[PDB]
RNA sequence: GGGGGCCACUAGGGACAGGAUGUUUUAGAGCUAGAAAUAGCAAGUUAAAAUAAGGCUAGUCCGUUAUCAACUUGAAAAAGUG
DNA sequence: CAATACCCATCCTGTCCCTGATGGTCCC
DNA sequence: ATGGGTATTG
């Protein structure tokens, strides 16, 4: 009794099948438990587990961090209130109490309902005086009078509660950067550097032009237009563009070779890098430009003169309010005069998108502008209002979405101003001025995380002392250093060879020395007289390092040949091997530090090694400039303040993969030399890192083995979670392992012969729009400016390719037409006959694919000559990738080995995740070791790609139609088992390539014809094969083409297939997040304990974690007479912990009495119930059901639907077409099969009748179209939740099962993971 | 085949610190002519508070991921059962 | 009860770690 | 997006 297992691992499914020697699927009687008359049941050993997608932790994390932010904002306000407590108690002893209960209805308010003052007169007077908070803010900033303390608190609290971003380090408002003066200083430094070519900037109103609410390039065009004989791409134009935020190219301005693209948003290097070529001579010039950027940016936020107020922000908000008032008055009068019938709809209808809906309804600024633009264009006198509308500056509010550009420094300026104003009248303000400022300014450093005390699995902070941390004691109670170190050390890897050693920083000098020597030691060179290529000696390698690697950032092969072999060795022709074009490794950190410290002798002295290694470490471990300075202070005596400042400014990111103790630490017992010592010099063997750690002559290997530790073993689940993959496929993996365990238990604990596994292949429009916007603005093209596109629009392949190609053909240097995209072609770079890649990375939009060249290869050489420059531009704009660029440019460098490789890649799985699944299964099956202490592989784990069984299905007409039912997962698993076992039986030599564990034309031919042994006749550029295919060596039979195909057909035709939808408790949010308005409904859920939703609104739509069958009695009528009931009670996710802590008390609180504690059945989502005539339902909620049956459509109809819908040789195409038309009656039959199914199980009379009418309406339609829509028809029959579908143009809405009463008398079915083991409970025997 | 260092390019996972809206109740005295329904007009831009109910471990912490047929013995974790 | 239509929080900045996919190079 | 909650109409 031998057998194999076939598995199909997917993101929502795991298919499984058991096969025997004859590729047959067994069938057993399985015991049935429960209280029904059935004691056993016949099961086929084939099925598929279904489950909802595994979810990512992203949403949970976002909610967690937002939670923390709300807590901490509340704490900011609490600090501020604690500061005011005593003096406010002297002014108004209940002010903060009125504030805390501002939400409460007056009935529930324990104080006066007017918050600020507590009487109606003063409150109305306040609001008349300061219609917005910014009015009071500006007053307190500018005025010299003593203010009411409550008014002060309100302004300061408004600044603290909404403080603004911190994306700008340092302080702000350096003389308030009025744009004219920075523009003038730019002109001045430009005229300083170019006295012969000066710019006349007189009469140019830079303030208006650069601060205008216009696009960057348009403001650039305006300013350039104000300068005759001066162009936008010149030096000054490029500087103004850089100040406006564009990406100008300074190459052409200074006749550069290096492309000097600069954007102020790598710039720190990109400027230094550039300055080198033209000197520091020009630095100040560019600097006078950078400042302007700041000013321009501030001109976006502060739209008022900054010399009339120290509150430019609040003044600009008041400008908004005043223009809103004026424009609203004018608009009201205009509409009164010209369109008097619309006035109401505009100013009274909250449902309409007029001013009413804009202020009181749900209309956004954008929706209101869209609603009122035609009304303004239709009337007269609205020209200025239309101008303000198109500038997005009409009837503006003050609390909006574009306020994210307001830095915290501005709010801080106004806060500090108010403090210095009123600290003269209150002493507690003066003595707590810096404290309040710190309340506004303090941020938890990202490298500290939560300030937990041992109850957060996310926390890592170390405390210098054990006491409550506040904004003013943070630097003292918290260890910024140890916390910033643990921030990274908990996420970095250790050296795999020496597990207890930390890896080196990636940009470590020692690490880069290692990499360069390791690459340089395998180089070989030949000259004319030499007999054989030779290695570089230790002396030669040191000479190359000193002369070349320590003088150029990158060392090319040309530099090696000329600057060394010619200069030193006196060789006119030298052939180099082991390195191509240039060296991969390089001593970049050496050159950074040589620029910064300018002491080459310091860098070359081995004595300073340690120090340098520390510095880089410090520069990499930390990112806070203050901390970097504090750490580098111990070397302050070695460098000037210039060098030390330049040194603290430089920072590195990322870490290496080896430890210092491996590179330059452990030494060989006899040589005393470390690894790096062998790299620098190793006789005439020049052994690299791998050889060094594998030669038994040396002790490196033995010490590596000894250093190895294993630690604690993960559980299966722990091991799977720590894998690298999408959590959905990990859910699939774990379910697969559980399935295999249960299947082995079914077979009497006998382990299978083989296990064949296949793994399915694997918001976004926002990323697409970002890709194109960046590529086109980096490109500098106005095709996006004239052709606007929305994010959704990029879900079209051809249009997305159009924008990625800048509207040009990719094989011809010509423009493409948008409206002609239907006439163009989308071609694969490397042909899909070789690389089955259908992504944008291997596809190209061209006018005609003929223009690619020959279709059997990579684009021809002529196209590459024509288009390499344009492709390089698309590559630098990141519109095409480097892999795409390399495949496009391969003709100047496709070989037969490449084709053999592509074909093998289509068949041999190499994804690491599938190998991990194979490793898990193999280590669970094969556990014993032989006499040589080598693993005994009883169970062979084979892995296959989907194309094998796909091609098998299409070649032998075992077609799949996914929409008919869920049987195709299990069928895929079965075919996988069969194909894999037969394949390794026929060619055992291929075990290496397909089983886990330890000429180009020949392999091309072989791997292309590997699957031909199944066929009877093969036509290959006609040969015929025997009926019985056997193994050549063993003589064992692998495939009988007369009998085994019939076996496969019978297995696919079997109607009983164990589909099991995984029952899962629901988790996540309590309910819909929308805070609904007050309503007289018990569906409303209180957002806080005392906030009765009928007064305050609240949530609805709670999510049921799982339902519960309650058999009890409830009071009835005014007499409270106990009446026995049996019903489904949905325990909501929020009620879950309370219900589980004590279920009797929970249920009695809900109203139930005398609950039978033993008849309480937990029913998760998708719980299975069987009713009459085999009709099945799954629990969707406590009050709704999903379809629970599969429609087992016969195989002839499945194949007919495949062929007819257009889901080879022209003669075979004709035979298939002829079979379609000869079996046309199948159509009606299929309908019949659906109807009898629906009437039996679905029970949607209206829908089935509408569908029958639709089918009888389109009987004259073409057969292909009718079949395509019959495919849609199965949405009515499909397992699971009902959904709407369309038969041609008729739309069928979903019939829901809005009542769960019937299942209380049906039979509940508990299934094991495979569905082979059942427990069935007659629920009709409960109640009375 | 499997594994490693490097280079180049991409696709995804995880954690932290922050920003702007939104929503909800209250506050921002609506007025007049009618008894009222209702008519006419005025006004509107702002704020406070909450933003998973809440928890104990009381931290400027934690509360939406992963995991879950049934049954026996189990406080549970977990084994066992056809 | 049955059918029907409607609703559903959104957007953004920064710092950092990790694997895996493809191509290439040098090795065990 | 899907698919369960909700109010409306009946
Ligand atoms: K009261
Ligand atoms: K000009
Ligand atoms: K609104
Ligand atoms: K190279
Ligand atoms: K860093
Ligand atoms: K010094
Ligand atoms: K879920
Ligand atoms: K879950
Ligand atoms: K490699
Ligand atoms: K916020
Ligand atoms: K009001
Ligand atoms: K289950
Ligand atoms: Mg809270
Ligand atoms: Mg708000």
For residue A57, the 8-state DSSP code is S
Hey, is A493 helix, strand or coil? coil
From the CA of A226, the nearest ligand is: 2
Residue A602 is encoded by which pair of tokens?
A: 């310091």
How far is A1117 from A1114, CA to CA, in rounded Å? 10
Does residue A309 reach within 7 angstroms of strand D, measured from its CB?
no
Contact A648, A626 (CB under 8 A): no
| Residues whose CB is less than 8 angstroms from the CB of residue A431 and which lie 6 or more positions away in sequence, other chains included | none
Indicate left, alpha or beta for A112 from its phi (over 0: left) and psi (-120 to 50: alpha): beta
> Closest nucleotide to residue A1107 (Cα to C1')?
D4
Indicate left, alpha or beta for A1243 from its phi (over 0: left) and psi (-120 to 50: alpha): left
Contact A1038, A982 (CB under 8 A): yes
Hey, is A1139 helix, strand or coil? helix
Does residue A999 reach within 7 angstroms of strand C, measured from its CB?
no
How far is A1191 from A1277, CA to CA, in rounded Å? 7
Strand A46-50 and strand A1058-1061: pairing?
A: parallel
Q: What is the dihedral of CA A232, A236, A242, A244, to 10 degrees?
A: -70
For residue A684, the 8-state DSSP code is T
Query: Which residue is closest to C16 in terms of CA–C1' distance?
Result: A488
Contact A609, A603 (CB under 8 A): no
CA atom of A1242 to C1′ atom of C6, Å = 25
Residue A365 is encoded by which pair of tokens?
A: 């600024």
Does residue A611 reach within 7 angstroms of strand D, measured from its CB?
no
CA atom of A1079 to C1′ atom of B30, Å = 26
Contact A412, A441 (CB under 8 A): yes
Residue A909 is encoded by which pair of tokens?
A: 């799985």
Q: Which residues pair with A1112 in a beta bridge?
A: A1125
Residue A138 is encoded by which pair of tokens?
A: 């500006």
CA atom of A876 to C1′ atom of B4, Å = 32
Instruction: Spell out the alpha helix ranges (H) of A24-93.
Output: 58-91
List, as one string, the DSSP characters of A526-571: E-SS-SS-EEPPHHHHHHHIIIIITT-SS-BHHHHIIIIIITTT--
Q: How was this structure determined?
A: X-ray
For residue A401, the 8-state DSSP code is S
Hey, is A1126 helix, strand or coil? strand
What's the gap in Å between A103 CA and the centre of ligand 11?
13
| Residues whose CB is less than 8 angstroms from the CB of residue A850 and which lie 6 or more positions away in sequence, other chains included | none
Name which of A1062, A1057, A1063 is nearest A968 in CA terms.
A1057
Sign of the four-CA dihedral A1062, A1065, A1066, A1068: negative
How far is A1231 from A1226, CA to CA, in rounded Å? 8
Does residue A445 reach within 7 angstroms of strand C, measured from its CB?
no
User: Which residue in this structure is represented by tokens 């950074």?
Assistant: A592
Residue A24 is encoded by which pair of tokens?
A: 């047959």
Per-residue H/E/C for A936-967:
CCCCEEEEECHHHHHHHHHHHCCCCCCCCCCH
From the CA of A636, the nearest ligand is: 6
What's the gap in Å between A414 CA and the centre of ligand 13?
29
Does residue A792 reach within 7 angstroms of strand C, measured from its CB?
no
| Residues whose CB is less than 8 angstroms from the CB of residue A1080 and which lie 6 or more positions away in sequence, other chains included | A1094
Indicate left, alpha or beta for A1322 from its phi (over 0: left) and psi (-120 to 50: alpha): beta
Residue A272 is encoded by which pair of tokens?
A: 């230094």
CA atom of A1205 to C1′ atom of B23, Å = 49
How far is A1213 from A853, CA to CA, in rounded Å? 29
Residue A439 is encoded by which pair of tokens?
A: 């309340």
> Closest nucleotide to residue A915 (Cα to C1')?
B2
**Cβ atoms < 10 Å from Cβ of A387:** 11
CA atom of A33 to C1′ atom of B71, Å = 9
H or E element that contains A1000: helix A1000-1008
How far is A789 from A303, CA to CA, in rounded Å? 30
Hey, is A1039 helix, strand or coil? strand
- Residue A101: half-sphere exposure toward Cβ, Cα within 13 Å: 17
From the CA of A506, the nearest ligand is: 5
Q: How far is CA A935 from CA A269, A918, A932, A940, in A?
A: 55, 15, 9, 12
Angle made by CA atoms A1273, A1276, A1278, in degrees to the nearest 5 = 100
How far is A215 from A223, CA to CA, in rounded Å? 12
Within chain A, what is the greatest distance between any pair of CA atoms? 117
Sign of the four-CA dihedral A1303, A1306, A1312, A1315: negative
CA atom of A166 to C1′ atom of C12, Å = 13
CA atom of A1076 to C1′ atom of B27, Å = 21
From the CA of A73, the nearest ligand is: 10
Does residue A496 reach within 7 angstroms of strand C, measured from its CB?
no
Contact A1277, A1242 (CB under 8 A): yes
Does residue A1073 reach within 7 angstroms of strand C, measured from its CB?
yes
What's the gap in Å between A43 CA and the centre of ligand 12?
17
Secondary structure of chain A: what % helix, strand, coil (to 5)? 50, 10, 40
Burial class (CB in 10 A: 0-12, 13-18, 19+), A1033: exposed
Sign of the four-CA dihedral A513, A519, A524, A525: negative
H or E element that contains A759: strand A754-759
Does residue A1182 reach within 7 angstroms of strand D, measured from its CB?
yes
Does residue A491 reach within 7 angstroms of strand C, measured from its CB?
yes
For residue A1240, the 8-state DSSP code is I
Q: What is the dihedral of CA A304, A308, A309, A312, to 10 degrees?
A: 10
How far is A979 from A1038, CA to CA, in rounded Å? 10
| Residues whose CB is less than 8 angstroms from the CB of residue A115 and which lie 6 or more positions away in sequence, other chains included | A98, A99, A102, A123
Query: Which residue is closest to B47 in terms of CA–C1' distance?
Result: A133
Burial class (CB in 10 A: 0-12, 13-18, 19+), A837: middle
Contact A60, A18 (CB under 8 A): no
H or E element that contains A16: strand A13-19
Sign of the four-CA dihedral A282, A288, A291, A297: negative
How far is A1292 from A1232, CA to CA, in rounded Å? 18
Does residue A584 reach within 7 angstroms of strand C, measured from its CB?
yes
Hey, is A828 helix, strand or coil? strand
Does residue A654 reach within 7 angstroms of strand C, measured from its CB?
yes
- Residue A359: half-sphere exposure toward Cβ, Cα within 13 Å: 10
H or E element that contains A1204: helix A1195-1204
Beta strands in A1253-1317 (DSSP E): 1285-1287, 1290-1292, 1307-1311
Total length of chain A:
1328
Does residue A1281 reach within 7 angstroms of strand D, measured from its CB?
yes
What's the gap in Å between A806 CA and the centre of ligand 2?
27
Phi then psi for residue A580, to 5 deg, are -130, 130
Q: Which nucleotides of D are covered by protein (CB under 7 A)?
A: 2-7
Residue A772 is encoded by which pair of tokens?
A: 């194109």
> Closest nucleotide to residue A1082 (Cα to C1')?
D6
Q: Which nucleotides of C are covered by protein (CB under 7 A)?
A: 1-5, 7-9, 11-28
Hey, is A894 helix, strand or coil? coil
- Residue A1110: half-sphere exposure toward Cβ, Cα within 13 Å: 26
Hey, is A810 helix, strand or coil? coil
Q: Which nucleotides of B are covered by protein (CB under 7 A)?
A: 1-10, 12-29, 42-55, 57-71, 82
What's the gap in Å between A1067 CA and the centre of ligand 8?
5
Residue A187 is encoded by which pair of tokens?
A: 């002109």
Does residue A1280 reach within 7 angstroms of strand D, measured from its CB?
yes
Beta strands in A582-662 (DSSP E): 655-659
Q: Around ion ligand 12, which residues have CB less than 5 A away? A: A 1063
CA atom of A699 to C1′ atom of C27, Å = 19
Rounded to 10°, the helix A1263-1273/A1195-1204 angle is 130
Does residue A1083 reach within 7 angstroms of strand D, measured from its CB?
yes
What's the gap in Å between A1146 CA and the centre of ligand 1?
35
CA A4 to chain centre: 38
Instruction: Spell out the alpha helix ranges (H) of A302-364.
Output: 312-338, 343-347, 355-359
How many Å is the Cα radius of gyration of chain A? 38
List, as one string, the DSSP characters of A1149-1197: HTTEES--TTS-EEE-BT-EEE-GGG-EEEE-SSS-EEE-------HHH
> Closest nucleotide to residue A1282 (Cα to C1')?
D3
Q: How far is CA A892 from CA A287, A866, A876, A1000, A1247, in A?
A: 44, 12, 20, 21, 62
Contact A5, A740 (CB under 8 A): yes
List, as one string, the DSSP characters of A774-798: HHHHHHT-THHHHS---SGGGGSHH
Hey, is A47 helix, strand or coil? strand
Q: What is the dihedral of CA A196, A202, A204, A210, to 10 degrees?
A: 60
Contact A1287, A1269 (CB under 8 A): yes
Q: Which residues pair with A828 in a beta bridge?
A: A843
Q: How far is CA A420 from CA A163, A167, A426, in A?
A: 19, 26, 10
Name which of A72, A103, A85 is nearest A153 in CA terms.
A85
Hey, is A921 helix, strand or coil? helix
Burial class (CB in 10 A: 0-12, 13-18, 19+), A641: exposed
**Cβ atoms < 10 Å from Cβ of A212:** 15
Burial class (CB in 10 A: 0-12, 13-18, 19+), A495: buried
**Cβ atoms < 10 Å from Cβ of A1162:** 15
| Residues whose CB is less than 8 angstroms from the CB of residue A442 and which lie 6 or more positions away in sequence, other chains included | A471, A472, A474
How far is A1253 from A1235, CA to CA, in rounded Å? 12
CA atom of A725 to C1′ atom of C12, Å = 28
What's the gap in Å between A428 CA and the centre of ligand 9?
67
Hey, is A1085 helix, strand or coil? strand
| Residues whose CB is less than 8 angstroms from the CB of residue A1233 and which lie 6 or more positions away in sequence, other chains included | A1191, A1193, A1194, A1197
Q: Which residues pair with A1130 in a beta bridge?
A: A1107
How far is A1175 from A1238, CA to CA, in rounded Å? 10
Domain extents for chain A? 72-167+408-486, 179-301, 312-405, 493-707, 764-893, 1069-1102, 1104-1164, 1187-1305
Rounded to 10°, the helix A1000-1008/A896-905 angle is 30
Burial class (CB in 10 A: 0-12, 13-18, 19+), A582: middle
Contact A965, A1052 (CB under 8 A): no
Residue A586 is encoded by which pair of tokens?
A: 């390089």
What's the gap in Å between A518 CA and the centre of ligand 9?
15
Contact A48, A1062 (CB under 8 A): no
Residues 398-437 of A with CB under 7 A from strand C: 404
Query: Which residue is closest to B27 in terms of CA–C1' distance?
Result: A114
CA atom of A1299 to C1′ atom of B24, Å = 33
Separate counts of helices (H) and strands (E) for chain A: 55, 30
In chain A, the N- to C-terminal Cα span, in Å, equals 50
Does residue A234 reach within 7 angstroms of strand D, measured from its CB?
no
Residue A899 is encoded by which pair of tokens?
A: 């084709």
How far is A805 from A827, CA to CA, in rounded Å? 14
CA atom of A783 to C1′ atom of B13, Å = 36
| Residues whose CB is less than 8 angstroms from the CB of residue A531 and which lie 6 or more positions away in sequence, other chains included | none
Name all contacts of A1090-1095 with Cβ < 8 Å and 24+ positions apart: A1090/A108, A1091/A103, A1095/A105, A1095/A108
How far is A507 from A592, CA to CA, in rounded Å? 10
């Amino acid at each position: 009794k031998k057998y194999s297992i076939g598995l199909a691992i997917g993101t929502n499914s795991v298919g499984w099948a058991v096969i025997t020697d004859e590729y047959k699927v067994p069938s057993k009687k399985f015991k049935v438990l429960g209280n029904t008359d059935r004691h056993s049941i016949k099961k086929n050993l084939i099925g598929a587990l279904l489950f909802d997608s595994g979810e990512t932790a992203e949403a949970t994390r976002l909610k967690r961090t937002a939670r923390r932010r709300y807590t901490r904002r509340k704490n900011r306000i609490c600090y501020l209130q604690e500061i005011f407590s005593n003096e406010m108690a002297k002014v108004d002893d209940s002010f903060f109490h009125r504030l805390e209960e501002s939400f409460l209805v007056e009935e529930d308010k324990k104080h006066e309902r007017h918050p600020i003052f507590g009487n109606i007169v003063d409150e109305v007077a306040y609001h008349e005086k300061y219609p917005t908070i910014y009015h009071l803010r500006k007053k307190l900033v500018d005025s010299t009078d003593k203010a009411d303390l409550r008014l002060i608190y309100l302004a300061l609290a408004h600044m603290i509660k909404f403080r603004g971003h911190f994306l700008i380090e340092g302080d702000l408002n350096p003389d308030n950067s009025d744009v004219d003066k920075l523009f003038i200083q730019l002109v001045q430094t430009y005229n300083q550097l170019f006295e012969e070519n000066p710019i006349n900037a007189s009469g140019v109103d830079a303030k208006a032009i650069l601060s205008a609410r216009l696009s960057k390039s348009r403001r650039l065009e305006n300013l350039i237009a104000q300068l005759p004989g001066e162009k936008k791409n010149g030096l000054f134009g490029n500087l103004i563009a850089l100040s406006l935020g564009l990406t100008p190219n300074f190459k052409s301005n200074f006749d550069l070779a290096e492309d000097a693209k600069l954007q102020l948003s790598t710039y720190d290097d990109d400027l230094d890098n550039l300055l080198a070529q033209i000197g520091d001579q020009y630095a100040d010039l560019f600097l006078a430009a950078k400042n302007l950027s700041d000013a321009i940016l501030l001109s976006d936020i502060l739209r008022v003169n900054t010399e009339i107020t120290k509150a430019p922000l609040s003044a600009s908000m008041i400008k908004r309010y005043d223009e809103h008032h004026q424009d609203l008055t004018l608009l009201k009068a205009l509409v009164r005069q010209q369109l008097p019938e619309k006035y109401k709809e505009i100013f009274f209808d909250q449902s309409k998108n007029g001013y009413a809906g804009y202020i009181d309804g749900g209309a956004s600024q954008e929706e209101f502008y869209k609603f009122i633009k035609p009304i303004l264009e239709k009337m007269d006198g609205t020209e200025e209002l239309l101008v303000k509308l198109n500038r997005e500056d009409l009837l503006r509010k003050q609390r909006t979405f574009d306020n994210g550009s307001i830095p915290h420094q501005i709010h801080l300026g106004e806060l500090h101003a108010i403090l210095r104003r009123q600290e003269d009248f209150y002493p507690f303000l003066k003595d707590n001025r810096e404290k309040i400022e710190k309340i506004l300014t303090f941020r938890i450093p990202y490298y500290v995380g939560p300030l937990a005390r041992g109850n957060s699995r996310f926390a890592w902070m170390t405390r210098k002392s054990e006491e409550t941390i506040t904004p003013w004691n943070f630097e003292e109670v918290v260890d910024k250093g140890a916390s910033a170190q643990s921030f990274i050390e908990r996420m970095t890897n250790f050296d795999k060879n020496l597990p207890n050693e930390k890896v080196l920083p990636k940009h470590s000098l020692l690490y880069e020395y290692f990499t360069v020597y390791n690459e340089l030691t395998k180089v070989k060179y030949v000259t004319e007289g030499m007999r054989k290529p030779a290695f570089l000696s230790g002396e030669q390698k040191k000479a190359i390092v000193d002369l070349l690697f320590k003088t150029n950032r990158k060392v090319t092969v040309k530099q090696l040949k000329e600057d060394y072999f010619k200069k030193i060795e006196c060789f006119d022709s030298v052939e180099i091997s082991g390195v191509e074009d240039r060296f991969n490794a390089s001593l970049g950190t050496y050159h950074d530090l040589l620029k910064i410290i300018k002491d080459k002798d310091f860098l070359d002295n081995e004595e300073n090694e340690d120090i340098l290694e520390d510095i880089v470490l410090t520069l990499t471990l930390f990112e806070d400039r203050e901390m970097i300075e504090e750490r580098l202070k111990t070397y302050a005596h070695l460098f000037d303040d210039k060098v030390m400042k330049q040194l603290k400014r430089r920072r590195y990111t990322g870490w290496g993969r080896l430890s210092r103790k491996l590179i330059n630490g452990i030494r060989d017992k006899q040589s005393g030399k470390t690894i790096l010592d062998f790299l620098k010099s190793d006789g005439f063997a020049n052994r690299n890192f791998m050889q060094l750690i594998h030669d038994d002559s040396l002790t490196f290997k033995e010490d590596i083995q000894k250093a190895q530790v294993s630690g604690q073993g993960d559980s299966l689940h722990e091991h799977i979670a720590n894998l690298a993959g999408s959590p959905a496929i990990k859910k699939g993996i774990l379910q697969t392992v559980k399935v295999v365990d249960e299947l082995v238990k079914v077979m009497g604990r006998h382990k299978p012969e083989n296990i064949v596994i296949e793994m399915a292949r694997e918001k976004n429009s926002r990323e697409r729009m970002k890709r194109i916007e960046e590529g086109i603005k980096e490109l500098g093209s106005q095709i996006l400016k004239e052709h606007p596109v929305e994010n959704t629009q990029l879900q079209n392949e051809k249009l997305y390719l159009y924008y990625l190609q800048n509207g040009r053909d990719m094989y011809v240097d010509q423009e493409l037409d948008i409206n002609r995209l239907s006439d163009y072609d989308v071609d694969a770079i490397v042909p899909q006959s070789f690389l089955k890649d259908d992504s944008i990375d291997n596809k190209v939009l061209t006018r005609s694919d003929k223009n690619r060249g020959k279709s059997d290869n990579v684009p021809s050489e002529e196209v590459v000559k024509k288009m390499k420059n344009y492709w390089r531009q698309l590559l630098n704009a990141k519109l095409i990738t480097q892999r795409k660029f390399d495949n496009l440019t391969k003709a100047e460098r496709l070989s037969e080995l490449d084709k053999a490789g592509f074909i093998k890649r289509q068949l041999v799985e190499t994804r690491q995740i599938t190998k991990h699944v194979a490793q898990i299964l193999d280590s669970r099956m094969n556990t014993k070791y032989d006499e040589n202490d080598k693993l005994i592989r009883e169970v062979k784990v084979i892995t296959l790609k989907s194309k094998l069984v796909s091609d098998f299905r299409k070649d032998f007409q075992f077609y799949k139609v996914r929409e008919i039912n869920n049987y195709h997962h299990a069928h895929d698993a079965y075919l996988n088992a069969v194909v894999g076992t037969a394949l390794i039986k026929k060619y055992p030599k291929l075990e290496s390539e397909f089983v886990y564990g330890d000429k180009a034309t020949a392999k091309y031919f072989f791997y292309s014809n590997i699957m031909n042994f199944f066929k009877t006749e093969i036509t290959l550029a006609i040969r015929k094969r025997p009926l019985i295919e056997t193994n050549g060596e063993t003589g064992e039979i692998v495939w009988d083409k007369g009998r085994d195909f019939a076996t496969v057909r019978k297995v696919l035709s079997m109607p009983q297939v164990n589909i099991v939808k995984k029952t899962e408790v629901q988790t996540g949010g309590f309910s819909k997040e929308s805070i609904l308005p007050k309503r007289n409904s018990d569906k409303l859920i209180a957002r806080k304990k005392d906030w009765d939703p009928k007064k305050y609104g609240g949530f609805d739509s709670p999510t049921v974690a799982y339902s519960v069958l309650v058999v009890a009695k409830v009071e009835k009528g005014k007499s409270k007479k106990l009446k026995s009931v049996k019903e489904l009670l949905g325990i909501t996710i929020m009620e879950r912990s309370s219900f589980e802590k004590n279920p009797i008390d929970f249920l009695e609180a809900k109203g139930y009495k005398e609950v039978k504690k033993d008849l309480i059945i937990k029913l998760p989502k998708y719980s299975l119930f069987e009713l009459e005539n085999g009709r099945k339902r799954m629990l969707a909620s406590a009050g709704e059901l999903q379809k629970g049956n599969e429609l087992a459509l016969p195989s002839k109809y499945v194949n007919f639907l495949y062929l007819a819908s257009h889901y080879g040789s022209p003669e075979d195409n004709e035979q298939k077409q002829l079979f379609v038309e000869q079996h046309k009656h199948y159509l009606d039959e299929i309908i019949e099969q659906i109807s009898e199914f629906s009437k039996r199980v679905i029970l949607a009379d209206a829908n089935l009748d509408k569908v029958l009418s639709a089918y009888n309406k389109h009987r004259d339609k073409p057969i292909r179209e009718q079949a395509e829509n019959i495919i849609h028809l199965f949405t009515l029959t499909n397992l699971g939740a009902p959904a709407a579908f369309k038969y041609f143009d008729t739309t069928i809405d979903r019939k829901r099962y809005t009542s769960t009463k019937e299942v209380l008398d049906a039979t509940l079915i508990h299934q094991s993971i495979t569905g082979l083991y059942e427990t069935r409970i007659d629920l009709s025997q409960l109640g009375g």
